[PDB]
Amino acid sequence: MSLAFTKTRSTIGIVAQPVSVEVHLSNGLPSFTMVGLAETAVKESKDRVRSAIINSQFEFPCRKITVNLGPANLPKTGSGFDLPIALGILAASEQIPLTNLANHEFIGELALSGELRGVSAIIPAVLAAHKDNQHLIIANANAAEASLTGHQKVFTANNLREVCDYLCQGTSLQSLPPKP
Amino acid sequence: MSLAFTKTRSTIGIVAQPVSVEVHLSNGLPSFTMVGLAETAVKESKDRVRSAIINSQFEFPCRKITVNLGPANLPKTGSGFDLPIALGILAASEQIPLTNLANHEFIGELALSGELRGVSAIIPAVLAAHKDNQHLIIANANAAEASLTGHQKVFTANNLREVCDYLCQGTSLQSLPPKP
Amino acid sequence: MSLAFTKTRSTIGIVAQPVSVEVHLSNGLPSFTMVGLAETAVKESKDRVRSAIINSQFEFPCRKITVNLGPANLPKTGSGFDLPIALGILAASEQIPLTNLANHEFIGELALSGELRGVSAIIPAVLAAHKDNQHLIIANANAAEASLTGHQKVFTANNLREVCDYLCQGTSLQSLPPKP
Amino acid sequence: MSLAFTKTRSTIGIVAQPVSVEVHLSNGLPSFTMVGLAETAVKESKDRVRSAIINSQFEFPCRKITVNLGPANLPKTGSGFDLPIALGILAASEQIPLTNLANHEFIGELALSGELRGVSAIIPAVLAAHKDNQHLIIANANAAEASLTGHQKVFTANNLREVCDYLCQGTSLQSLPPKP
Amino acid sequence: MSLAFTKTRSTIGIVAQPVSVEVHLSNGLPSFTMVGLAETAVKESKDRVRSAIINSQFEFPCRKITVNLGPANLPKTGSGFDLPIALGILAASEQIPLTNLANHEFIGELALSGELRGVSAIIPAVLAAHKDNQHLIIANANAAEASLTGHQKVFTANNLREVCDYLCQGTSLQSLPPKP
Amino acid sequence: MSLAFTKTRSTIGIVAQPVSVEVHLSNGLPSFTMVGLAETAVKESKDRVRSAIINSQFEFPCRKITVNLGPANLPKTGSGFDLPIALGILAASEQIPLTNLANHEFIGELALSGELRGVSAIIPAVLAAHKDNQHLIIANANAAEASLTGHQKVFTANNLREVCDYLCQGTSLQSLPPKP
């Protein structure tokens, strides 16, 4: 069977509580289910992620998908849950080796072309990821904001193809710009 | 490809936050998903855009239509998203050459005849468009309001066919009144 | 094509905003879609219009109906939108020549037999139609209330067949009784 | 044709406004639509009346029933709309001659088996039916409250077949208020 | 005829209002419809009744059930409507002699297996049953609370099959153990 | 037959009322019904439990599931109802002997891999289970919180297979950490 456990961060107040996106593909009819108290802003990432995956020259599963963005108590608010979901889908469809996601935290928003967009309130997530020793991968638009941290384990990408190539083969991504 | 990008502006308060209308025509059955936090454009812009496209002697895709409006975490209020969405559908269906959509914004609401009615609070959009060096193509009913600025590279249109010809061809569209 | 426009009024407070009912018949399956922020009272006019057209010895289209009500950002409240919509459907289905609907403004709801019924707050609509020099056609029940103002160029009908006859061949259509 | 115009009264505040319950059996698949701002306590009248009409040895049409009860903009709120709706449905089915509902106002809900039940706030309906010159009909349970007025033309009954007889062949409901 | 009039008591304020649970069984496709102001806790009772009936080695009809618990204007907020509904459905499909429900008031919910459970605020129901001289039947768990009154004629049971046998044959379920 | 009961606790106020979980597998089409006053956080457990059962190398019933968690008046508002539901489903589908669950109480949510996660406020459940003398089984993440009571019979586990072996085979494992 195939299931993937991607990591990310959700901000509640000042602390970015860890969140564990958990995709799981079944053999039933091609539905799409999201649980874990997903707010409307994050409950509509279904079609957005579908388009961002199809447009990046990938195979979007024709299978019963079931995302589980939850510790079931915490409601999810931000819009940065598209990159974790897309990478979880790809990893659970065997298009990405699941061992690449060992210790990475992904935060990003996907357009309909696969291009990544900048989420808001990124600093708490970067601080939490640094404190947890995890690698963080964010959209280019947040590179300027996260440059202050000066943490050497943060990478920024332009689109989903960049992140997929980095995970599968490690093409160096883009690092973060120098501290101001 | 079947992916098109368009630009418009949503007015919250006094600022006109740029919006990125993204249309992606998939291969499934007829659908018109409109992700992005639209309130009254959700289920109303669909039918107006469909009828305006059909009545202007255009092919309406018999596919799964996914429309994603600008930033995900930004409620979108006005009714002027019919022209950007219609042009995005036409571009994604190749009925318009999308290589000429880069420098132009679009604002307006479409009737069922393909005619362009006048949206409210338009001058902020003109200011923003000129600041960014973009052509702003608005409905004829807002020509009076747009003429105050006298900004060059701004235009106004009677119906959707006028704009589609101004893009496919290069016919001068309407210009603006000199300064009534 | 199968596309007809009608005019009516929407009374809020002391001002009767102009509303342009727009009807389009497409080739899809049977359906009836309203647009323009129509409230429950307005949005429930579908069945009333259907039965009023059917019982008046007219032909109700089997096509997909699509009614767009005037400005897309103005909620519609009154119940007098049944007559404009019925006339729009008949005009779009070629049952009526649509040149007659040029300068007239129609108000008044429809019973299930095709007979017209009165609607509250009719004086502002009469005033607005007077300022625009538009032939107003209202339900016969509203004659006893409108005629007190002694305003001419306003005609009152009892059933949809009467209005259709007046538009097709100018068969009188009664008139507001003397001020008495 | 298939149409019927029953009558009843709706009580808001102290006054009881006239409410013309109307029916139209259109050709098509089985269906049932209750137009006219009907609240839930009226919207279950669908099943209530269907069961009453199949438990009173009557025929329930297999046609697209369309029960409109206006004035449309009046928020019907009571629950004694089952009897007028059932009578109108029967009349539109040519089971009850429609020449008998000319001067009869009906009130009182229907039990699942056919027996009429008592609705609250009946006195204002009695007062209005007195100030219209109508044969007001109520459930037997309301005889105690109708007696206080002592008015005539206030016949009452226990089940549907009692009131169907008072209309078709067998007159003399013979349940006038106990005391003048 | 597949009809059954069971009875129960609804408690609002201090008085236990009478409730007449009425069940019909049409000849259509399988369905289920609860009529009246059935609150959430009541309308979920459909599956509870179905499971309790199936597990008790009874026969669940494959018909278009239609449960109506009047009056239609009194909210049914309690949860002890499960047992009366199950008994009515059984009696409708010639599974319980209808006559045996002559003067019995049933209160208490069910589980999937059919075992009865206690309900809150039982004393007023017993007081009303004594006043109206009905053979009240309550859940076994409610026996302890229904002792302070000390009224006779009140029976208790744990399984729905016990009540079915008592109604069909008569087995003296229990005797409401006395108090000092 | 295919009916299985499981026990758990819901914290309402300061007390942990028992919540009997009941699972019924009918013969109809594949479905899933959660009867009882279950909030979104609880009725979103269908997908979680299905995925946890499938991914643990178990068999998920291809039947009309019907989950009831009584009483039908307590607003079940916890987040650790997934483990009792999964255990009940497995027992109902003759996958776990039903005699094992006769004395144990279960708590803890599930992931899409079957691993158990830590619910909030486990202490009241431990206190109530000790008072009633039931073997409480909780997720490993709650071991630290459950250690500060000193009560034995608080065995823990990491995934569904662990608890299944604990019941089926008897591989008792894990326990409260010493007594800090």
PDB file of N, CA and C in Angstrom, chain C residues 63-129:
ATOM      1  N   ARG C  63     -35.633  24.244 -23.051  1.00  0.00           N
ATOM      2  CA  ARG C  63     -34.206  24.518 -23.007  1.00  0.00           C
ATOM      3  C   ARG C  63     -33.783  24.897 -21.588  1.00  0.00           C
ATOM      4  N   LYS C  64     -32.492  25.175 -21.431  1.00  0.00           N
ATOM      5  CA  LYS C  64     -31.957  25.657 -20.164  1.00  0.00           C
ATOM      6  C   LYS C  64     -32.173  27.163 -20.070  1.00  0.00           C
ATOM      7  N   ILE C  65     -32.902  27.594 -19.055  1.00  0.00           N
ATOM      8  CA  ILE C  65     -33.174  29.010 -18.844  1.00  0.00           C
ATOM      9  C   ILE C  65     -32.062  29.598 -17.989  1.00  0.00           C
ATOM     10  N   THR C  66     -31.767  30.875 -18.220  1.00  0.00           N
ATOM     11  CA  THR C  66     -30.746  31.580 -17.450  1.00  0.00           C
ATOM     12  C   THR C  66     -31.175  33.034 -17.342  1.00  0.00           C
ATOM     13  N   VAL C  67     -31.652  33.430 -16.166  1.00  0.00           N
ATOM     14  CA  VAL C  67     -32.163  34.774 -15.933  1.00  0.00           C
ATOM     15  C   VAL C  67     -31.137  35.532 -15.104  1.00  0.00           C
ATOM     16  N   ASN C  68     -30.638  36.635 -15.652  1.00  0.00           N
ATOM     17  CA  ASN C  68     -29.727  37.532 -14.955  1.00  0.00           C
ATOM     18  C   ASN C  68     -30.473  38.822 -14.655  1.00  0.00           C
ATOM     19  N   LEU C  69     -30.520  39.199 -13.380  1.00  0.00           N
ATOM     20  CA  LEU C  69     -31.370  40.293 -12.918  1.00  0.00           C
ATOM     21  C   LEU C  69     -30.526  41.548 -12.726  1.00  0.00           C
ATOM     22  N   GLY C  70     -30.586  42.446 -13.706  1.00  0.00           N
ATOM     23  CA  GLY C  70     -30.043  43.778 -13.574  1.00  0.00           C
ATOM     24  C   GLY C  70     -28.639  43.804 -13.005  1.00  0.00           C
ATOM     25  N   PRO C  71     -28.315  44.853 -12.249  1.00  0.00           N
ATOM     26  CA  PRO C  71     -26.976  44.945 -11.658  1.00  0.00           C
ATOM     27  C   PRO C  71     -26.655  43.714 -10.824  1.00  0.00           C
ATOM     28  N   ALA C  72     -25.412  43.249 -10.937  1.00  0.00           N
ATOM     29  CA  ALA C  72     -24.988  42.037 -10.251  1.00  0.00           C
ATOM     30  C   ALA C  72     -24.663  42.263  -8.780  1.00  0.00           C
ATOM     31  N   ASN C  73     -24.557  43.513  -8.334  1.00  0.00           N
ATOM     32  CA  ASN C  73     -24.208  43.822  -6.953  1.00  0.00           C
ATOM     33  C   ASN C  73     -25.379  44.396  -6.165  1.00  0.00           C
ATOM     34  N   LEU C  74     -26.583  44.392  -6.732  1.00  0.00           N
ATOM     35  CA  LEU C  74     -27.753  44.958  -6.073  1.00  0.00           C
ATOM     36  C   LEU C  74     -28.724  43.841  -5.714  1.00  0.00           C
ATOM     37  N   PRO C  75     -28.892  43.494  -4.438  1.00  0.00           N
ATOM     38  CA  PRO C  75     -29.858  42.445  -4.092  1.00  0.00           C
ATOM     39  C   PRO C  75     -31.269  42.831  -4.511  1.00  0.00           C
ATOM     40  N   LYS C  76     -32.028  41.835  -4.958  1.00  0.00           N
ATOM     41  CA  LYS C  76     -33.391  42.027  -5.438  1.00  0.00           C
ATOM     42  C   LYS C  76     -34.367  41.495  -4.399  1.00  0.00           C
ATOM     43  N   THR C  77     -35.331  42.327  -4.012  1.00  0.00           N
ATOM     44  CA  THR C  77     -36.238  42.022  -2.910  1.00  0.00           C
ATOM     45  C   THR C  77     -37.676  41.806  -3.356  1.00  0.00           C
ATOM     46  N   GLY C  78     -38.259  42.767  -4.066  1.00  0.00           N
ATOM     47  CA  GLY C  78     -39.681  42.722  -4.346  1.00  0.00           C
ATOM     48  C   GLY C  78     -40.099  41.444  -5.047  1.00  0.00           C
ATOM     49  N   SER C  79     -41.403  41.177  -4.985  1.00  0.00           N
ATOM     50  CA  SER C  79     -42.005  40.018  -5.628  1.00  0.00           C
ATOM     51  C   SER C  79     -42.555  40.336  -7.011  1.00  0.00           C
ATOM     52  N   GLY C  80     -42.296  41.532  -7.528  1.00  0.00           N
ATOM     53  CA  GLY C  80     -42.855  41.940  -8.801  1.00  0.00           C
ATOM     54  C   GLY C  80     -41.992  41.562  -9.985  1.00  0.00           C
ATOM     55  N   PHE C  81     -41.067  40.627  -9.784  1.00  0.00           N
ATOM     56  CA  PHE C  81     -40.155  40.202 -10.835  1.00  0.00           C
ATOM     57  C   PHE C  81     -40.703  39.059 -11.678  1.00  0.00           C
ATOM     58  N   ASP C  82     -41.919  38.586 -11.405  1.00  0.00           N
ATOM     59  CA  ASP C  82     -42.453  37.471 -12.176  1.00  0.00           C
ATOM     60  C   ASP C  82     -42.894  37.907 -13.569  1.00  0.00           C
ATOM     61  N   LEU C  83     -43.532  39.075 -13.683  1.00  0.00           N
ATOM     62  CA  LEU C  83     -43.989  39.519 -15.000  1.00  0.00           C
ATOM     63  C   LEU C  83     -42.824  39.856 -15.919  1.00  0.00           C
ATOM     64  N   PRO C  84     -41.817  40.626 -15.495  1.00  0.00           N
ATOM     65  CA  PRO C  84     -40.673  40.855 -16.388  1.00  0.00           C
ATOM     66  C   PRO C  84     -40.000  39.570 -16.824  1.00  0.00           C
ATOM     67  N   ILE C  85     -39.861  38.601 -15.918  1.00  0.00           N
ATOM     68  CA  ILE C  85     -39.186  37.356 -16.268  1.00  0.00           C
ATOM     69  C   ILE C  85     -40.027  36.546 -17.245  1.00  0.00           C
ATOM     70  N   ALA C  86     -41.343  36.494 -17.031  1.00  0.00           N
ATOM     71  CA  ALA C  86     -42.205  35.763 -17.953  1.00  0.00           C
ATOM     72  C   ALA C  86     -42.161  36.385 -19.343  1.00  0.00           C
ATOM     73  N   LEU C  87     -42.248  37.714 -19.413  1.00  0.00           N
ATOM     74  CA  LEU C  87     -42.184  38.374 -20.710  1.00  0.00           C
ATOM     75  C   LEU C  87     -40.824  38.168 -21.361  1.00  0.00           C
ATOM     76  N   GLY C  88     -39.754  38.189 -20.567  1.00  0.00           N
ATOM     77  CA  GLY C  88     -38.438  37.923 -21.118  1.00  0.00           C
ATOM     78  C   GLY C  88     -38.324  36.524 -21.689  1.00  0.00           C
ATOM     79  N   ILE C  89     -38.871  35.534 -20.983  1.00  0.00           N
ATOM     80  CA  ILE C  89     -38.833  34.160 -21.482  1.00  0.00           C
ATOM     81  C   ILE C  89     -39.602  34.057 -22.790  1.00  0.00           C
ATOM     82  N   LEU C  90     -40.801  34.644 -22.835  1.00  0.00           N
ATOM     83  CA  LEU C  90     -41.591  34.579 -24.059  1.00  0.00           C
ATOM     84  C   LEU C  90     -40.873  35.266 -25.215  1.00  0.00           C
ATOM     85  N   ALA C  91     -40.273  36.431 -24.961  1.00  0.00           N
ATOM     86  CA  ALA C  91     -39.545  37.127 -26.014  1.00  0.00           C
ATOM     87  C   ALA C  91     -38.353  36.310 -26.493  1.00  0.00           C
ATOM     88  N   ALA C  92     -37.603  35.719 -25.561  1.00  0.00           N
ATOM     89  CA  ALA C  92     -36.433  34.938 -25.938  1.00  0.00           C
ATOM     90  C   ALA C  92     -36.822  33.675 -26.691  1.00  0.00           C
ATOM     91  N   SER C  93     -38.027  33.163 -26.463  1.00  0.00           N
ATOM     92  CA  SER C  93     -38.502  31.975 -27.157  1.00  0.00           C
ATOM     93  C   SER C  93     -39.253  32.306 -28.440  1.00  0.00           C
ATOM     94  N   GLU C  94     -39.169  33.549 -28.912  1.00  0.00           N
ATOM     95  CA  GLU C  94     -39.818  34.017 -30.131  1.00  0.00           C
ATOM     96  C   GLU C  94     -41.337  34.014 -30.029  1.00  0.00           C
ATOM     97  N   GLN C  95     -41.893  33.734 -28.848  1.00  0.00           N
ATOM     98  CA  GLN C  95     -43.338  33.807 -28.676  1.00  0.00           C
ATOM     99  C   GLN C  95     -43.858  35.230 -28.817  1.00  0.00           C
ATOM    100  N   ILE C  96     -43.017  36.229 -28.573  1.00  0.00           N
ATOM    101  CA  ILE C  96     -43.411  37.630 -28.683  1.00  0.00           C
ATOM    102  C   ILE C  96     -42.353  38.363 -29.498  1.00  0.00           C
ATOM    103  N   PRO C  97     -42.722  39.342 -30.326  1.00  0.00           N
ATOM    104  CA  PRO C  97     -41.698  40.207 -30.929  1.00  0.00           C
ATOM    105  C   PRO C  97     -41.096  41.119 -29.870  1.00  0.00           C
ATOM    106  N   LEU C  98     -39.770  41.112 -29.779  1.00  0.00           N
ATOM    107  CA  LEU C  98     -39.069  41.775 -28.689  1.00  0.00           C
ATOM    108  C   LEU C  98     -38.829  43.256 -28.946  1.00  0.00           C
ATOM    109  N   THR C  99     -39.307  43.788 -30.074  1.00  0.00           N
ATOM    110  CA  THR C  99     -39.257  45.232 -30.275  1.00  0.00           C
ATOM    111  C   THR C  99     -40.236  45.952 -29.356  1.00  0.00           C
ATOM    112  N   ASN C 100     -41.355  45.306 -29.025  1.00  0.00           N
ATOM    113  CA  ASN C 100     -42.359  45.943 -28.181  1.00  0.00           C
ATOM    114  C   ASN C 100     -41.832  46.210 -26.778  1.00  0.00           C
ATOM    115  N   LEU C 101     -40.912  45.381 -26.294  1.00  0.00           N
ATOM    116  CA  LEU C 101     -40.371  45.514 -24.947  1.00  0.00           C
ATOM    117  C   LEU C 101     -39.315  46.604 -24.838  1.00  0.00           C
ATOM    118  N   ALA C 102     -39.225  47.502 -25.819  1.00  0.00           N
ATOM    119  CA  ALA C 102     -38.134  48.470 -25.845  1.00  0.00           C
ATOM    120  C   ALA C 102     -38.253  49.474 -24.705  1.00  0.00           C
ATOM    121  N   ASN C 103     -39.336  50.245 -24.685  1.00  0.00           N
ATOM    122  CA  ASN C 103     -39.475  51.363 -23.762  1.00  0.00           C
ATOM    123  C   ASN C 103     -40.401  51.070 -22.590  1.00  0.00           C
ATOM    124  N   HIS C 104     -41.024  49.897 -22.550  1.00  0.00           N
ATOM    125  CA  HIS C 104     -41.937  49.568 -21.468  1.00  0.00           C
ATOM    126  C   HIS C 104     -41.178  49.076 -20.242  1.00  0.00           C
ATOM    127  N   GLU C 105     -41.768  49.311 -19.072  1.00  0.00           N
ATOM    128  CA  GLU C 105     -41.292  48.755 -17.814  1.00  0.00           C
ATOM    129  C   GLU C 105     -42.423  47.953 -17.191  1.00  0.00           C
ATOM    130  N   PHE C 106     -42.135  46.710 -16.822  1.00  0.00           N
ATOM    131  CA  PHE C 106     -43.143  45.784 -16.330  1.00  0.00           C
ATOM    132  C   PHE C 106     -42.939  45.527 -14.844  1.00  0.00           C
ATOM    133  N   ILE C 107     -44.042  45.518 -14.095  1.00  0.00           N
ATOM    134  CA  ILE C 107     -44.025  45.231 -12.667  1.00  0.00           C
ATOM    135  C   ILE C 107     -45.273  44.429 -12.327  1.00  0.00           C
ATOM    136  N   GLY C 108     -45.182  43.662 -11.243  1.00  0.00           N
ATOM    137  CA  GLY C 108     -46.327  42.885 -10.771  1.00  0.00           C
ATOM    138  C   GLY C 108     -46.038  41.399 -10.837  1.00  0.00           C
ATOM    139  N   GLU C 109     -46.369  40.707  -9.752  1.00  0.00           N
ATOM    140  CA  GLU C 109     -46.169  39.271  -9.680  1.00  0.00           C
ATOM    141  C   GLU C 109     -47.264  38.543 -10.456  1.00  0.00           C
ATOM    142  N   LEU C 110     -47.066  37.239 -10.633  1.00  0.00           N
ATOM    143  CA  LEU C 110     -47.981  36.392 -11.386  1.00  0.00           C
ATOM    144  C   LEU C 110     -48.559  35.326 -10.470  1.00  0.00           C
ATOM    145  N   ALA C 111     -49.879  35.172 -10.504  1.00  0.00           N
ATOM    146  CA  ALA C 111     -50.513  34.041  -9.851  1.00  0.00           C
ATOM    147  C   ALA C 111     -50.181  32.765 -10.619  1.00  0.00           C
ATOM    148  N   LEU C 112     -50.643  31.630 -10.098  1.00  0.00           N
ATOM    149  CA  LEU C 112     -50.400  30.362 -10.772  1.00  0.00           C
ATOM    150  C   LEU C 112     -51.312  30.149 -11.970  1.00  0.00           C
ATOM    151  N   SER C 113     -52.347  30.970 -12.132  1.00  0.00           N
ATOM    152  CA  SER C 113     -53.244  30.890 -13.275  1.00  0.00           C
ATOM    153  C   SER C 113     -52.851  31.829 -14.405  1.00  0.00           C
ATOM    154  N   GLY C 114     -51.785  32.606 -14.234  1.00  0.00           N
ATOM    155  CA  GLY C 114     -51.425  33.649 -15.162  1.00  0.00           C
ATOM    156  C   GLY C 114     -51.971  35.012 -14.795  1.00  0.00           C
ATOM    157  N   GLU C 115     -52.961  35.064 -13.908  1.00  0.00           N
ATOM    158  CA  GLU C 115     -53.514  36.338 -13.473  1.00  0.00           C
ATOM    159  C   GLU C 115     -52.487  37.111 -12.658  1.00  0.00           C
ATOM    160  N   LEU C 116     -52.429  38.418 -12.885  1.00  0.00           N
ATOM    161  CA  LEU C 116     -51.495  39.268 -12.166  1.00  0.00           C
ATOM    162  C   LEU C 116     -52.030  39.602 -10.780  1.00  0.00           C
ATOM    163  N   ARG C 117     -51.109  39.909  -9.871  1.00  0.00           N
ATOM    164  CA  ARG C 117     -51.443  40.324  -8.518  1.00  0.00           C
ATOM    165  C   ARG C 117     -50.687  41.601  -8.189  1.00  0.00           C
ATOM    166  N   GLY C 118     -51.229  42.363  -7.245  1.00  0.00           N
ATOM    167  CA  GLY C 118     -50.600  43.602  -6.852  1.00  0.00           C
ATOM    168  C   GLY C 118     -49.376  43.385  -5.982  1.00  0.00           C
ATOM    169  N   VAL C 119     -48.522  44.406  -5.946  1.00  0.00           N
ATOM    170  CA  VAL C 119     -47.311  44.390  -5.140  1.00  0.00           C
ATOM    171  C   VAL C 119     -47.236  45.688  -4.352  1.00  0.00           C
ATOM    172  N   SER C 120     -46.690  45.599  -3.143  1.00  0.00           N
ATOM    173  CA  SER C 120     -46.602  46.761  -2.275  1.00  0.00           C
ATOM    174  C   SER C 120     -45.540  47.733  -2.779  1.00  0.00           C
ATOM    175  N   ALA C 121     -45.630  48.971  -2.297  1.00  0.00           N
ATOM    176  CA  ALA C 121     -44.663  50.017  -2.617  1.00  0.00           C
ATOM    177  C   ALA C 121     -44.541  50.203  -4.128  1.00  0.00           C
ATOM    178  N   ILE C 122     -45.654  50.611  -4.737  1.00  0.00           N
ATOM    179  CA  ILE C 122     -45.699  50.827  -6.178  1.00  0.00           C
ATOM    180  C   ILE C 122     -45.477  52.287  -6.562  1.00  0.00           C
ATOM    181  N   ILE C 123     -45.759  53.232  -5.664  1.00  0.00           N
ATOM    182  CA  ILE C 123     -45.651  54.646  -6.023  1.00  0.00           C
ATOM    183  C   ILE C 123     -44.231  55.019  -6.431  1.00  0.00           C
ATOM    184  N   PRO C 124     -43.180  54.620  -5.708  1.00  0.00           N
ATOM    185  CA  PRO C 124     -41.826  54.979  -6.161  1.00  0.00           C
ATOM    186  C   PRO C 124     -41.517  54.475  -7.558  1.00  0.00           C
ATOM    187  N   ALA C 125     -41.985  53.274  -7.898  1.00  0.00           N
ATOM    188  CA  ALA C 125     -41.770  52.757  -9.244  1.00  0.00           C
ATOM    189  C   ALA C 125     -42.483  53.616 -10.277  1.00  0.00           C
ATOM    190  N   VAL C 126     -43.711  54.041  -9.977  1.00  0.00           N
ATOM    191  CA  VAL C 126     -44.439  54.908 -10.897  1.00  0.00           C
ATOM    192  C   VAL C 126     -43.687  56.216 -11.089  1.00  0.00           C
ATOM    193  N   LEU C 127     -43.190  56.793  -9.996  1.00  0.00           N
ATOM    194  CA  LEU C 127     -42.434  58.038 -10.086  1.00  0.00           C
ATOM    195  C   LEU C 127     -41.204  57.863 -10.970  1.00  0.00           C
ATOM    196  N   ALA C 128     -40.419  56.815 -10.708  1.00  0.00           N
ATOM    197  CA  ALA C 128     -39.197  56.604 -11.473  1.00  0.00           C
ATOM    198  C   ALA C 128     -39.505  56.381 -12.947  1.00  0.00           C
ATOM    199  N   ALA C 129     -40.528  55.577 -13.248  1.00  0.00           N
ATOM    200  CA  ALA C 129     -40.896  55.355 -14.639  1.00  0.00           C
ATOM    201  C   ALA C 129     -41.379  56.641 -15.293  1.00  0.00           C
TER     202      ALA C 129
END
